[PDB]
Ligand binder design. Structure first.
Ligand SMILES: *[C@@H]1O[C@H](CO)[C@@H](O)[C@H](O)[C@H]1NC(C)=O
Ligand SMILES: *[C@@H]1O[C@H](CO)[C@@H](O)[C@H](O)[C@H]1NC(C)=O
Ligand SMILES: [Ca+2]
Lengths: 100, 70
């Protein structure tokens, strides 16, 4: 795979939905091998990476732990913008300078 | 500021009280349609409606104006 996990951290997901979103993303990263590349991005009125990785990194134990620990730190605030978040997602899957 | 020849007191009359009665109903409907989202989030419809408050404010300050000058 080459996933890109687009979390929606906007206002309306606060509360339970955010607990479920961060558990779901943890268990989505758990289904990734070392041949699969992943990167978690989150959007609320503008999209940004949840972690330090700015591209698709490999889904090995260390990178997956960094992504999980970033995801669990995520917080809900602001209006949702699907266009600005999907621009980010589609642009990060066209980045061929990195190993993929 | 007690200027007579109002001509606005005759506007307080049959039809312009049945239009205010309708602007209030429209306003109550608009306040009914709104949805409050948890943290600064806004539905598309609430952003759509937040662009009518100036109309209602205009009509209501107009009512204050005409009643006060009349
Ligand atoms: C991540 O968690 C730490 C620990 O409280 C916090 O200080 C930091 O603000 C969080 N990350 C971001 C990007 O705010
Ligand atoms: C990728 O490499 C090209 C060629 O050097 C460069 O122009 C571009 O800025 C690099 N970065 C991205 C995100 O494409
Ligand atoms: Ca939202």
């Amino acid at each position: 795979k080459d996933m890109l996990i687009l979390v929606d951290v906007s206002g309306s997901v606060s509360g339970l939905t955010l607990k479920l979103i961060r558990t779901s993303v943890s268990e989505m990263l758990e289904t990734l091998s070392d041949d699969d590349f992943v990167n978690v991005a989150s959007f609320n009125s503008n999209a940004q990476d949840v972690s330090c990785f700015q591209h698709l990194v490999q889904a090995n134990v260390r990178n997956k732990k960094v992504l999980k620990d970033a995801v669990n730190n995520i917080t809900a605030k602001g209006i949702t913008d699907y266009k600005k978040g999907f621009s980010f997602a589609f642009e990060q899957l066209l980045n061929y300078n990195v190993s993929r | 500021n007690i200027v007579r020849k109002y001509a606005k007191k005759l506007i307080d009359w049959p039809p312009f009280e049945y239009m205010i009665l309708a602007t209030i109903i429209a306003n109550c409907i608009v306040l009914a349609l709104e949805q409050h989202l948890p943290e600064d989030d806004k539905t598309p419809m609430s952003r759509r409606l937040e662009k009518t408050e100036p109309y209602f404010i205009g009509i209501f300050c107009f009512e204050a104006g005409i009643k006060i000058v009349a």
